[PDB]
C-alpha cells in the first residue's frame, strides 16, 4: 500500500498495525506475512483471541506467485499451482479453539481490476471462506454508501453463535428485502436506519410496521 494509507493506519487504530509498502520487493512481503501469521499462531496458542484485518489477498497472492521458483506447471494467467499453496494456507489458518483463544481472519479481495489472474484467485477462493461480504460498483456510482451487495452476501452457520430473536427479525427482514433490487433496497435501509438509534429499535419498528 502507498505510504499515506499506512500513516492513516497507525494514527487511527488502537492496536499495533503492520504495513509493508510497495517500495520493498516481494520477498519482504513474503517474510513479513509468514512471520506475522506465525506470531498470531503463537499468541492464539496461549488462549488469547487474535483478529487480523488483511488487505489484500490479491497482493499477497501476487507476492507469493512472484517469489517462488517456477515448478514447470503453470495454469491460466501464468500462475503456478504450488505458488497458490501458501496464500491458501494463510487464509485457512483461521479457526476457533474450544481449549482457549481464537483466530479470526477478515481479508479483502480485488475483483475486475483489469487483470486476468485476479479473477482466477477470486474464483479459487470462493468456497474456502465461510463468511462473505460483497461490494458493488453500481451502488457506489450513485454515491450512496456503503455499497455492499446485501442479497448475495451472507454467512453460514450463523444460528449457532447468537440469540435467535434477532434471527427471526433478520429472517423476516430477508423476506421483505429479497424481491426488490439491491440499490433501492440500500437507500431504503439507510433511510430507515438514519432515524433510529440502535439496531434493536429499528428491529421493533420494522416489526410493528
Amino acid at each position: 500500500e502507498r505510504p499515506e494509507e499506512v500513516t492513516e493506519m497507525q494514527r487511527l487504530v488502537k492496536g499495533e498495525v503492520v504495513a509493508s509498502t510497495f517500495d520493498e520487493p516481494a520477498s519482504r512481503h513474503v517474510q513479513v506475512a509468514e512471520m506475522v501469521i506465525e506470531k498470531a499462531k503463537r499468541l492464539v496458542e496461549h488462549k488469547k483471541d487474535v483478529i487480523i484485518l488483511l488487505d489484500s489477498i490479491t497482493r499477497l497472492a501476487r507476492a507469493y506467485n512472484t517469489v517462488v521458483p517456477a515448478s514447470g506447471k503453470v495454469l491460466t494467467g501464468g500462475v503456478d499451482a504450488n505458488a497458490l499453496h501458501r496464500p491458501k494456507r494463510f487464509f485457512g489458518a483461521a479457526r476457533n479453539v474450544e481449549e482457549g483463544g481464537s483466530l479470526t481472519i477478515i481479508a479483502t479481495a480485488l475483483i475486475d481490476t483489469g487483470s486476468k489472474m485476479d479473477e482466477v484467485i477470486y474464483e479459487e477462493f470462493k468456497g474456502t471462506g465461510n463468511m462473505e461480504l460483497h461490494l458493488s460498483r453500481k451502488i457506489a456510482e450513485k454515491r450512496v454508501f456503503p455499497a455492499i451487495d446485501y442479497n448475495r452476501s451472507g454467512t453460514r452457520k450463523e444460528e449457532l453463535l447468537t440469540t435467535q430473536e434477532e434471527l427471526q427479525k433478520m429472517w423476516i427482514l430477508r423476506k421483505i428485502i429479497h424481491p426488490m433490487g439491491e440499490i433501492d433496497a440500500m437507500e431504503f435501509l439507510i433511510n430507515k436506519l438514519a432515524m433510529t438509534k440502535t439496531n434493536d429499535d429499528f428491529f421493533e419498528m420494522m416489526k410493528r410496521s
Partner: peptide
C-alpha cells in the same frame, strides 16, 4: 429445527463449561 439448533447450542455450552 429450533429443537435441534438449541440442542447443538446446549451441547456446545456444556462442553465449554466442562473445559
Amino acid at each position: 429445527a429450533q429443537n435441534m439448533i438449541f440442542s447443538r447450542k446446549s451441547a456446545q455450552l456444556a462442553s465449554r463449561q466442562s473445559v
